[PDB]
A paper describes a structure:
[name] belongs to the widespread, evolutionarily ancient formate-nitrite transporter (FNT) family of pentameric anion channels and translocates formic acid bidirectionally. Central to the FNT family’s function are conserved histidine and threonine residues (H209 and T91 in [name] [name]), both of which are essential for pH-dependent formate:H+ symport into fermenting [name] cells. Here, we show the high-resolution structure of native [name] [name], together with the H209N variant, and describe the dynamic pore features that couple to the protonation state.
Here, we identify compartmentalized polarity distribution across the complete [name] pore structure – resolved at 2.56 Å – mirrored against a two-fold axis with H209 at its center. Thereafter, 3665 micrographs were collected, displaying clear side and top views of the pentameric protein complex, leading to high-quality 2D class averages. The final [name] structure was reconstructed from 302,937 single-particles, achieving a resolution of 2.56 Å (FSC = 0.143), and showing a thorough sampling across orientations (Sampling Compensation Factor (SCF) = 0.87, Supplementary Fig. 3H), with the local resolutions being ~2.3-2.7 Å. In addition, compared to HSC’s pore-forming N-terminus and PfFNT’s β-barrel, [name]’s N-terminus forms a loop parallel to the pentameric cytoplasmic face, creating the flattest surface among known [name] structures, and generally among FNTs. This flatness of the surface is imposed by the entirely flat positioning of the N-terminal α-helix on the cytosolic face of the [name] pentamer, as compared to other FNTs. Resolving the complete [name] structure allows us to trace the formate channel in the native assembly. The channel is constrained by mainly hydrophobic residues, especially phenylalanine, whereas the periplasmic side displays a partially positive charge, conveyed by lysine (K68 and K165) and histidine (H155) residues. The formate channel around this key residue is highly constrained: while the H209 is coordinated by an interaction with T91 (dvdw = 3.6 Å), which supports in vivo data indicating that this represents the open channel, the channel’s path itself is sterically confined by two opposing phenylalanine residues (F75 and F202), forming a spatial gate. In addition, side chain flexibility can modulate the effective pore diameter, as illustrated by comparing the “radius”, defined by the side chain atoms, with the “free radius”, based on the main chain atoms. The difference between these radii suggests that side chain flexibility can act both as a steric barrier that shifts dynamically and as a mechanism of substrate selectivity, since the substrate must remain in contact with the side chains to pass. In particular, the Phe-gate of F75 and F202 plays a crucial role in this dynamic channel range.
Residue numbers in the entry:
A (entry chain A), B (entry chain A), C (entry chain A), D (entry chain A), E (entry chain A): 6 to 281
The structure:
């Protein structure tokens, strides 16, 4: 009663979590999804801050420290009970157990995905009004522009597979937190699995619903003083469009995200510990 | 009974905390507010110490390590029960529940804000008498001068939004500590959320009530040996005035601080878990 | 009842773990072995990510930080209950106690080894489809090529002894986690012992069932744009063949792995605490 | 009963600690004071070791890592129950409660201060006999000489105020450990507050009773091979005398140390939580 | 019952530990001593790995990180119950209490010292067969050669005093682990005290029974390709002999080790908390 949960018990807590989430009031789900969109946006802002000025640093060392900074948003989601689309894909365990319906799964996923977008877009506005892009002599905004520009240059299969790898890591972090009982147990078990996906360039749909939109805003409304300082032009980031974001990144990464956490984490552990 | 609190229970502990704080004796509130002004001043002195000599270092890596150093002051506030204006804005949860009155909220906020200023100003005196500005051949005082000078060059909207972002981070750190039961749980859950706001250049009213006043004192009473060593003049910091501090930074950052923690952390979680 | 287990009690939990593992359903053992093959593959991908760009860094400092990144896969195996061939060699404690049969030990080892290979090979496919080898301008794939190429140049005795050293470290990490009761205890006790084997270049059979196969795939299907960027040719990695992998690395490292954990960790602790 | 102590309860544990310490047998107090003098000496030796060779490093980053190394001595004092003059100043809480007499407070302070000096001086002897000053080609002894030389060049007010700041940090670390219940809680809560005072150049009387005496011994008995390697002469450290130590540093820093922890930590918390 | 042990209770657990250790079966003591010789050998191999390539790094920063790597071996000894000669010197507390006889103390010390040598020498063989000396282009073996060569150039008094300082640190780490109740408490309380002795160049008899023997083996059986790569000759390490090891290092460091932990940690704490 003070010891970590075992893999069979962690599977039952995952099942009850999905029964709770899918049966919560819709507006509560939307409000918790807006907080999770804001939490993932804060974590990406922390990642961009920590990775500003790190071109002289070893590539993997810079990516790792920024990945530990991105871990805050997932810890916030778990401790504060926010609804993140990636983690909410694990309600498939409750679906496989027949404890929830397909319409309950579909309505919860649309509520969380849409709310996560509203929260991520609201944080872009506040981040734009803060003048943060001009930090480090515009190097903060150039980091966002360069991060957002690469996330739109992947092929469909590359984006789907990068999404599978990201939600596998996120859902394994959320699954391992089920074993935890304290706040330190749950939080620290999630640092390394998130650092990994962020350092390894895996794609998360909600994280990208903040990064690419923010880079599109910088390219469009950045000052000429920004372009002078960073020594570039908006035409170097011409492919940073809303349509390129949905087609090139959002659609394939989201498809991959569902497959990663749903099939690999959720349905595997249901087969091993719950199908019985 | 050994496990972390859940989001609904954390909301009730936030409500009872505000009922406690707003109903404490006024002089106890003033004395705890002076300690919190001193605690935030110590954390900024630690930030300045850690970030002295870091112009050769990657911008975000230097900001992150100084942000972990600033986390000490918030941990001190939480463990030692000090009254910080930013965290005391969460007494709006008790106000929304009708458990406290508007005059109780207004009197507690003025008591904490004024006491936080007295504590921050008392630490400036002790820091000035210590000769700390001449540390690192005056590089410690130049770090304070350069930090204080930028905090006065923001537009009203930029300062308000930077204040919203800071108190959102501070109040989310304080909210997540409510889940904690041990000293390690509460303290470590607050490191990354504070590092973020400090590394990301967000503005905290009480932190600025120490930084800018300290930079004004250095500009005015620094020795000619200081200006020789740092290779600058007081005229490079002409906009570091008390009037510029209140108008350019204090008023807008404080307005933003109330909106960040009160509306975003407090009233959101009251709607989701307490409005019932 | 809240204190760490003592060496005698940790030996009994090791015995009961082997009785559980060897008596689990075969398909459950195969499925948990596929997850462990994927978990060790994720840890090596994290190691490669963190160690990309670190030729300018001190050799041991770069190896140590990548070793902490590889620790995630073992933590995942322990918390999520996955079957790793290295840790499953400790079922020899149950065999020595006469609590399991030799055919039970042989069938479990073949089930785990084969499943660990399937999981490691499935992750190579996903990693190849992600385009990750072209990360850091191909420096990610060159790190894999250079890591895989050295792991095939050892003599039989060197490979056997490097395998003994690796499984001694892995099984001592798994043994020390038996003392732990919380998730933080079990996880953190395993970081330094795994970092050591990874930093010290010891050889793990399942880790190599991902690294060398992945390097063979890069050498064979890498783009000419990859070879241009990394400034090399596939002929620099001619000895990266499937046959060289089995003979030069897989067979001797696996023999060594059994001796390291089975004889040194398992049969020693059985003699001291269970032979009674 | 598993949760951290609250500020009111931490004040009562501080009161009972002072009643215990002031009423312990005098020889037990002297022996525990000699251990605390040795513990603070070990922490300064660790600080000097970690900060040797760090002139190429950013000033604050080098000071911070050495400050975490100095934290060991305070952790040792708290866990092993040693009597450190700085922490024993908090017996003023028991004095203010009328639970101890003024003669009990005076006799305990003289016993601890004298014993702390004996322990610090005994460690200087062992450190001198070890030949440690010649480590890093004499750079270890030059670090001690340069650290000790600056600690004697402060004005009386600067030294008193640097002593107030040091014992405020030390006594706040000791106060926050009262909230802790486990060994990890108590130890980790004391790392950042001690790192701060060490990184920020604050002055501790017992730490200086090891540093300056050790630098005086190096200046006087260092080999000519030492002066050749470090490229200096004893005449560069002419002000490192026993009389300069007492007048320039010991007397004012000790006065400041009493004011810092006694008045600021002890009498403040007694007014807020115990004067009732 | 969940709180750390107090200094008086930690003294009684130290007394009962020595009564257990000295009364264990001799062959169990020999087998646990062989594991401790292997555990300290692994920690030194980790130290050498982490400190390879660190001549460009600040001396103290490199020594500190390698010292955290050496901490693994002591954690392993404590968690896995191994018999290390340094920690077994604390059975003097049971001897002083009259709970064990002088012949029991002498027989246990010889059993542990001899077994620690067998384990350290067995790990040298495995490390030699692994080809690890050629790691980092022979820089791993040169680090061992340079570490082993300096450990033989100390005077008798320097070696005795460096041994006193090492076992004081090791026995204080073991004493502080007695306060711990969890695996994280016991393990983390031992990291900084061990890092200190390793970073500060203190001498441990069992650690040296692996380092110097390993350097003698490299000097004697290293390939001419090793000497070419490292750009040296065996004649640069002529004083690395077995006879120089015993006389110059083993005998004086062991004498010092007994005095450090026995008299300073054991007999002091027995006088303060057990002589009653």
């Amino acid at each position: 009663p003070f010891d970590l949960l075992l893999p069979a018990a962690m599977a039952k807590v995952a099942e009850e979590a999905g029964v709770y989430k899918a049966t919560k009031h819709p507006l509560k789900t939307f409000y918790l999804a807006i907080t999770a969109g804001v939490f993932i946006s804060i974590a990406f802002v922390f990642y961009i801050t920590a990775t500003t000025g790190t071109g002289t640093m070893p590539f993997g060392m810079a990516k790792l420290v920024g990945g530990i900074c991105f871990s805050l948003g997932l810890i916030l989601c778990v401790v504060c009970g926010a609804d993140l689309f990636t983690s909410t894909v694990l309600i498939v365990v409750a679906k496989a157990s027949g404890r929830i319906t397909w319409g309950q799964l579909a309505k919860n996923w649309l509520n969380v995905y849409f709310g996560n977008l509203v929260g991520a877009l609201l944080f872009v506005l506040l981040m734009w009004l803060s003048g943060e892009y001009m930090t480090a002599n515009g190097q903060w905004g150039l980091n966002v522009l360069q991060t957002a520009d690469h996330k739109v240059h992947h092929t469909f299969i590359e984006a789907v597979c990068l999404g599978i790898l990201a939600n596998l890591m996120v859902c394994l972090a959320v699954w391992m937190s089920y074993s935890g009982r304290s706040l330190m147990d749950k939080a620290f078990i999630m640092v390394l699995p998130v650092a990994m996906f962020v350092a390894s360039g895996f794609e998360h749909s909600i994280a990208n619903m903040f990064m690419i939109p923010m880079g599109i805003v910088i390219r469009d409304f950045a000052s000429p003083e920004f372009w002078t300082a960073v020594g570039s032009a908006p035409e170097n980031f011409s492919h940073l469009t809303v349509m390129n974001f949905i087609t090139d990144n959002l659609i394939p990464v989201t498809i991959g995200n569902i497959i990663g956490g749903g099939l690999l984490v959720g349905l595997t552990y249901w087969v091993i510990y719950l199908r019985e």
